[PDB]
Design a protein around this ligand. Structure first.
Ligand code: SAH
Ligand code: SAH
Lengths: 355, 351
């Protein structure tokens, strides 16, 4: 907390207005945290501290920065609980926890660096233009070189979502009678780095997976499959997935963080294509930010979904669609939803061909 | 909360890393809230809803916006608890609470609009350049256009601070029937002085600020009914001519703009302007020399220092540094008082 709420006591109209103003101000200054964290990334702070903890003066020397400003930046990161700081008689030493090392450094499996760079290069300028997008809207009538360049960074920056999602999905798949000793096949449409598929392949040693994405992303996905030891059972088909050629006979077709990019018309097209690629008894899994039609921020997942929709508007995307809309798309594809599972920031919808 | 933490439990190394990643992501997406709130201001959303609650389609018609994007924006504001939304059979209606109407609309006493505009015009672009400022530093050897907006946008800090200060002044034997005089150095809208004048009906106050801000301050004094006891002296307060004989000299949100050398100069000038038994009050973001984020005020002070670096400002100074400045001016601190986001230091001439 950045406001001592115990000092905002009172129940007059003025008291309540002043208290609200402090709370709104605290919300507004949430701007500062990404600015500090992303500046630290740009300067190399996290990689430097992971290699060798140091005081602000040493870090400023190593990173060719101003010593006073570096101390301010590091103490702000400490105040955000992003880095740790030990105080001795000699002085201070800043360092990263093992968890932060894994999240903040380039090149790790769960690195947020891709999210830092998406913010720096794309989201920060776009958010400043949000009013203009709300004024003018967007039209409904593959990713171009711009969006592909953006995804090149972003896909690695959202790897951290995958493990809880795959653990939940895998538990349901096992409980539904799907064995890791079966030679099942998975299709991962718009696979990004392929982490969802690749974690499934680690969980189910006899399965194989095919990921669809554009060429530059498919390259990243194959490299990560090798890093995860599943290279022999993971393959990519590079190109625009609207050009068909998905293969057939899949026991699982996965759409993670894909449907919110679509229009209703394109969503129905994708769902029907998935249904045509299913093996007997195959399943479609949708992982996305989904909210009830009442659009109430009841749960963390609902609240995030409503905020994420603003992010989609910010970059000219689709929407946080409702459960009811996904139901219509399942029906249009001859599928019926069999399960809805909560995950930390998403829902999983599982569907099979209607009986 | 935007993350269902009950679904990130576990104590393996991987479990802990993935949980931290979700928590860091949640921190990063704090960017979205000012963007949504400030876009809504730019579009006229808050003023429109305060006048007449409406569904998203009606508001889109009234504000000449896209209906789908307006619904997204309004539901995001609802998710942030900035606006309220009622669901009937007819449909939805968005509206503002009385508290929000006072905070979000232009022209109210506690309006955050000046903070919205400071962000839009100044802070947003600057924060994107923070790495360059850290690389290159700042020296010790536009802002007026900015302050014209920002000073009204920080009025909301004043009432809790003045209530705390006034309580201490009364407990220290200062009467509202005394013809005491206050100097408010860099007074901004003058709200601190003006609230003191309401609390202490026989006091008078002089605010120092640049001409355009002094104009705002005199207009607000009239709005608060204290016009006969509040006056401004317009100009650069480094050019002297502060007057003398003040029972209270107030520096609110001023010292963090200074260098150590300029801070000592200001403190000494205040001391020379004090009546016998006069007090200096410093209201600022102040932290212990250990710079530990123990309390909300300490944590905010450390983050505010980054905001100062962002705009090429001073620092969140330490209690120990203010003590040195008091000593250099022949003053001694007699009290430290916490407020929601600041500390008040009170000092008198040392005996
Ligand atoms: N028409 C298209 N053809 C191929 N890939 C596409 C595509 N439209 C979007 N994509 C890909 O879909 C992905 C969206 S981001 C989601 C990636 C991954 N499923 C995850 O959840 O982590 C990107 O990798 C993007 O390149
Ligand atoms: N040299 C100078 N001469 C006059 N006013 C100055 C000044 N340097 C800064 N100021 C004023 O100091 C104020 C800083 S903002 C703080 C305003 C007010 N005390 C409050 O706490 O709300 C601005 O109004 C700015 O114009």
């Amino acid at each position: 907390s950045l406001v001592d709420e115990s000092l905002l006591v009172g129940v007059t109209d003025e008291d309540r207005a002043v208290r609200s103003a402090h709370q709104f101000y605290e919300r507004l200054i949430g701007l500062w945290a990404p600015a500090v964290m992303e500046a630290a990334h740009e300067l190399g702070v996290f990689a430097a501290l992971a290699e060798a903890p140091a005081d602000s003066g040493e870090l400023a020397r190593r990173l060719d920065c101003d010593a006073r400003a570096m101390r301010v930046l590091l103490d702000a990161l400490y105040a955000y609980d992003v880095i740790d700081r030990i105080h001795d008689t000699n002085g201070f030493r800043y360092l990263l926890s093992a968890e932060a090392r894994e999240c903040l450094l380039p090149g790790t499996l769960f690195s947020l660096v891709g999210k830092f760079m998406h913010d720096i290069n794309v989201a920060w300028p776009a958010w400043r233009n949000l009013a203009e997008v709300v004024r003018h809207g967007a039209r409904d009538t593959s990713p171009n070189g711009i969006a592909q360049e953006d995804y090149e960074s972003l896909v690695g920056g959202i790897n951290f979502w995958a493990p809880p999602i795959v653990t939940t999905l895998s538990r349901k798949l096992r409980a539904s009678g799907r064995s890791g000793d079966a030679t099942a096949s998975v299709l991962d449409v718009g696979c990004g780095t392929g982490l969802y598929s690749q974690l499934l392949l680690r969980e189910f040693p006899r399965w194989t997976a095919t990921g669809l994405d554009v060429e530059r992303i498919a390259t990243l996905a194959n490299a990560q499959a090798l890093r995860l030891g599943v290279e022999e059972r993971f393959a990519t088909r590079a190109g625009d997935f609207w050009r068909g050629g998905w293969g057939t006979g899949y026991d699982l077709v996965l759409f993670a963080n894909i449907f919110h990019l679509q229009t209703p018309a394109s969503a129905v097209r994708l769902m029907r294509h998935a249904a045509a690629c299913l093996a007997p008894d195959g399943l479609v899994a949708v992982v996305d930010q989904i909210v009830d039609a009442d659009r109430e921020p009841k749960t963390p997942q609902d609240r995030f979904a409503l905020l994420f929709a603003a992010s989609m508007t910010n970059t000219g995307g689709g929407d946080a669609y409702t459960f009811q809309e996904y139901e219509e798309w399942f029906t249009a594809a001859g599928l019926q939803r069999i399960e809805t599972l909560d995950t930390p920031m998403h829902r999983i919808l599982l569907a099979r061909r209607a009986t």
